[PDB]
């Protein structure tokens, strides 16, 4: 005989506090994504640029052709443009949504040519309740070989 | 000969993002250079330094009174700093001067054995018309000599 629930109830939904049962994959699993880069420096600045590659076939470019993505070295680093995203979320109410955000990856070399750096992700609307919210997300890349033959990157200075 | 007269309303825009320094020979403004005592501490899973800033006319000395010490965190390939909630104050797009929330960070890319990278200004109101602007300064660190004996800096993993 348990105590009947009557009357108006909060109920609360701790999301920042989810987790995972165990398992031993990364949940969410990472993003692995294959790239076909190219670079050109001036005296005064370099930039480079990556064709998308297929995931079922890394020899093949990315159909429809995804956008060519652009990075630039500064200040230690290899940036790219931060791109305005939408994003569809929840807000504290319940409601669906989306919110505005900014995204790039940022990547330090490493001596054996590795790169470690992150993905950043800034909110800027406030929908769900997250404007200002920044989120970080470590990324690796590693170089696995050189251009497949049948792909084009174009020239990063144009 | 005589000018138009200036007779009525007027709007007067002063362009600021075009302002420029006459030609001289020297970063204007001048570069701020800044000297650190540091010490870091790393475990297996991971590394943070701190620095103790020394005085600008002596690199002998603390700097007095006490600057509170500078926290790094090394993750990602790079140093970084925590956010400082620093207000800033400014004029906004009316003239009328206030102030404005900024969070300010230093990251610090290690190189072959010095350092490059940053300091990131983040403004979040807009008493000045600036809200979500993002100021990058680049900046360089170089270890210059040993720690001077004077001087201690705290342990990173205090705090």
Known sequence: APVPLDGTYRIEIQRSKQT???TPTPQPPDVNTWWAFRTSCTP???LAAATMLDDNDHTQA???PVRPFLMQFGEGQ???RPETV???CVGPNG???TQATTQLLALRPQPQGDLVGE???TVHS?????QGAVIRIPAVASRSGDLPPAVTVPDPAT
């Open 20 to 22: 995972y049962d165990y």
């Open 44 to 46: 005064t600045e370099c």
């Open 62 to 64: 990315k159909t429809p």
């Open 78 to 80: 290899w940036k790219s």
């Open 86 to 88: 939408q994003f569809p």
């Open 95 to 97: 409601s669906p949504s």
């Open 119 to 121: 993905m950043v992700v």
């Open 126 to 130: 406030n929908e769900c309740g997250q």
